[PDB]
Amino acid sequence: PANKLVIVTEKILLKKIAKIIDESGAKGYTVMNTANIKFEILTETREMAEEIADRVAVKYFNDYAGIIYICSAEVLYGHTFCGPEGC
Amino acid sequence: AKPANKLVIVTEKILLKKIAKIIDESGAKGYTVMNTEANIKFEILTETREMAEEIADRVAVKYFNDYAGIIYICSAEVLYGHTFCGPEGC
Amino acid sequence: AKPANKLVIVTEKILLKKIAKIIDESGAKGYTVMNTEANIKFEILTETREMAEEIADRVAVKYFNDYAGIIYICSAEVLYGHTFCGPEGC
Amino acid sequence: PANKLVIVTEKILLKKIAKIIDESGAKGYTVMNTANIKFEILTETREMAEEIADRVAVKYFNDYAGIIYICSAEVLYGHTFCGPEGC
Numbered sequence: 001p002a003n004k005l006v007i008v009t010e011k012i013l014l015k016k017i018a019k020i021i022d023e024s025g026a027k028g029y030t031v032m033n034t035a036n037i038k039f040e041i042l043t044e045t046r047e048m049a050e051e052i053a054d055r056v057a058v059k060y061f062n063d064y065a066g067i068i069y070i071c072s073a074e075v076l077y078g079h080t081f082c083g084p085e086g087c
Numbered sequence: 088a089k090p091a092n093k094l095v096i097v098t099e100k101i102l103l104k105k106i107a108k109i110i111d112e113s114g115a116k117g118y119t120v121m122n123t124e125a126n127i128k129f130e131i132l133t134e135t136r137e138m139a140e141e142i143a144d145r146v147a148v149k150y151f152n153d154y155a156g157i158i159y160i161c162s163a164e165v166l167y168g169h170t171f172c173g174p175e176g177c
Numbered sequence: 178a179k180p181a182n183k184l185v186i187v188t189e190k191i192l193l194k195k196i197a198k199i200i201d202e203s204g205a206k207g208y209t210v211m212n213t214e215a216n217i218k219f220e221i222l223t224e225t226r227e228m229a230e231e232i233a234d235r236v237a238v239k240y241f242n243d244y245a246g247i248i249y250i251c252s253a254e255v256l257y258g259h260t261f262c263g264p265e266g267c
Numbered sequence: 268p269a270n271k272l273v274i275v276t277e278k279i280l281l282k283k284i285a286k287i288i289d290e291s292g293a294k295g296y297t298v299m300n301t302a303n304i305k306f307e308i309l310t311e312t313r314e315m316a317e318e319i320a321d322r323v324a325v326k327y328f329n330d331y332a333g334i335i336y337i338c339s340a341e342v343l344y345g346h347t348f349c350g351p352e353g354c
């Protein structure tokens with residue numbers, strides 16, 4: 001998958017955020033204690049990661065502390081060769 | 088801290104030691120490297136965007152005329168934030 | 178520190194929330210969970226062997242009569258060591 | 268793979284240990300700064316991990332500091348079902 005979302009926030013939100021991640025269609029996530037927890041979620045699309053982030057921040061970030069980071073893969077260099085069997 | 092920048096390099100196995108040395112010289116925090124038998128894949132963590140670009144430019148300029156590979160980068164940006172700190176904590 | 182004990186659980190997707198709650202209650206440091214569509218795989222880190230066994234026993238006793246799964250553990254032991262410390266460092 | 272070796276040691280040994288890992292037949296490794304570096308190596312067999320550890324400690328651990336940890340997977344519980352298409 002070409003996109004990664006990271007959410008660092010208060011431990012109290014663990015179950016509520018895990019449920020958002022499940023409902024989003026994401027294939028999995030990592031969560032670790034880091035008073036605070038850090039989620040990492042890989043997504044096939046940019047939009048899926050943005051939508052998780054919107055749902056979490058709109059629901060919780062007026063009342064709870066947290067930070068959400070996103071990245072999308074950008075190809076910098078490429079050199080490819082293939083033939084009939086290998087393409 | 089912001090998450091580390093991630094650089095991924097997929098290329099020919101023969102370049103393993105030369106690329107590992109480039110990664111070390113750049114000041115990267117670390118990397119994973121795996122066979123993916125003819126090919127290897129590096130996933131490299133760097134503190135800054137500039138350090139990841141240094142590795143990418145060094146590898147591609149030196150080798151990508153003669154060897155096959157792909158290099159991509161994932162650099163985190165803040166999308167939402169809500170933080171508090173006081174006398175002991177900032 | 179010794180590396181964390183690793184517990185891996187592969188089982189049916191429907192148990193996702195019940196197992197995540199067991200992992201949290203046990204005091205584990207964290208976990209990864211991934212679809213592996215019908216099945217999920219947890220990889221869980223725990224500070225102690227006892228904490229990983231607690232999760233394993235809780236999950237298998239509660240669910241493994243009725244649901245399919247496998248649970249395995251990897252607990253690190255020291256094989257070789259050579260360490261030095263002095264006044265500032267021990 | 269069912270076995271994991273972890274080596275924590277002095278940064279000066281980075282290239283020498285990476286070369287041992289390559290020569291062992293292992294499929295890959297992770298290495299991170301942790302003055303010190305930490306290697307993680309997954310191996311298909313217990314013997315492969317032990318052999319990496321022996322080679323590193325015999326060569327270096329009289330003169331350099333480090334620690335090497337090993338684990339092998341132990342199945343605790345299992346319940347399997349399959350039919351003609353799925354076994």
Ligand code: NA
Pocket residue numbers: 058059060061062063064
């Ligand atoms: Na709120």
Ligand code: NA
Pocket residue numbers: 325326327328329330331
């Ligand atoms: Na020595």
